[PDB]
Structure 1
Amino acid sequence: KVFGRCELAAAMKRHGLDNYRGYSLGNWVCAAKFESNFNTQATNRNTDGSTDYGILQINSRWWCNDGRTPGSRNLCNIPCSALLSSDITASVNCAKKIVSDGNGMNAWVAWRNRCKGTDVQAWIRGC
């Protein structure tokens, strides 16, 4: 499914992402917009043989297991296929592990390049 902006903000808030590990909700909505365009089924293949999966583009080298990525670590202990559900539970739970690993939201390239440093609260305005 393709979430609307406020629809995703409300779901992310129910799943505990607002201010999680120091990141206000607008960070997570902005991240999803530029990572997946709010589509829970987005996938993108990388040069290293990994693939990024779902609404938050979680990577198959470090975080989820897709069975075809060399050097897999599966630190979220989840099959990547579960991250293509229209229900964001599995992606949120893995995102919480990622953002707790020591480099904050810098794991998300699109967030680093296109959200960080902007007024991210605008992404939840009007909701």
Structure 2
Amino acid sequence: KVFGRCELAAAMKRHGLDNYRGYSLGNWVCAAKFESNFNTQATNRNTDGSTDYGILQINSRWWCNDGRTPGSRNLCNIPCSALLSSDITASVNCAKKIVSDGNGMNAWVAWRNRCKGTDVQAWIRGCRL
């Protein structure tokens, strides 16, 4: 599915992402916008043979297992196919591990380049929450 901006903000808040490990809700909504354009089925292949899956473009070399990526670590212990669900539970649970294991939200290239440093509060402005 394709989430609306405030629709995804509400769902991400219900799943505990607001201020998680120091990142306000707008960071996560902005991340999803530029990672997947709010599409839960987005997938993209990378130069290292890995693939990014889903609303938060979770990677098959480190985080989820897609059975075709050498050196797979599967640190989220989840098949990548589960991350293409319209329900964001598995993606959020894995994202909490990613942002806890390394350098914050910098793992997400699109967030790093196109969200970090801007006023991310604008991404939840006007939403019901």
Counterparts of residues 1-127 of structure 1 (less than 5 Å):
1-127=1-127
Per-residue deviation, 1:102 = 2.5
Task: Give RMSD over aligned pairs.
Answer: 0.3
| Matched pairs, number | 127
Listed one character per residue, the Cα deviations across residues 65-122 of structure 1 (whole Å, up to 9, x for unaligned) are: 0000011000000000000000000000000000000300000000000000000000
- Which consecutive unaligned segments of at least 5 residues does structure 1 have? none
Rounded to whole Å, the distance in 2 between the matches of 1:29 and 1:76 is: 21
Q: Structure 2 length as normaliser, TM-score?
A: 0.98
- Which consecutive unaligned segments of at least 5 residues does structure 2 have? none
Rounded to whole Å, the distance in 2 between the matches of 1:79 and 1:106 is: 23
Rounded to whole Å, the distance in 2 between the matches of 1:26 and 1:61 is: 27
Listed one character per residue, the Cα deviations across residues 17-55 of structure 1 (whole Å, up to 9, x for unaligned) are: 000000000000000000000000000001111000000
Rounded to whole Å, the distance in 2 between the matches of 1:16 and 1:112 is: 21
Rounded to whole Å, the distance in 2 between the matches of 1:71 and 1:121 is: 37
Per-residue deviation, 1:11 = 0.0
Rounded to whole Å, the distance in 1 between the matches of 2:72 and 2:38 is: 26
Q: Secondary structure at the match of 1:67?
A: coil
Q: Structure 1 length as normaliser, TM-score?
A: 1.00
Rounded to whole Å, the distance in 1 between the matches of 2:78 and 2:121 is: 30
Rounded to whole Å, the distance in 1 between the matches of 2:55 and 2:69 is: 20
Rounded to whole Å, the distance in 2 between the matches of 1:94 and 1:16 is: 13
Rounded to whole Å, the distance in 2 between the matches of 1:102 and 1:39 is: 26
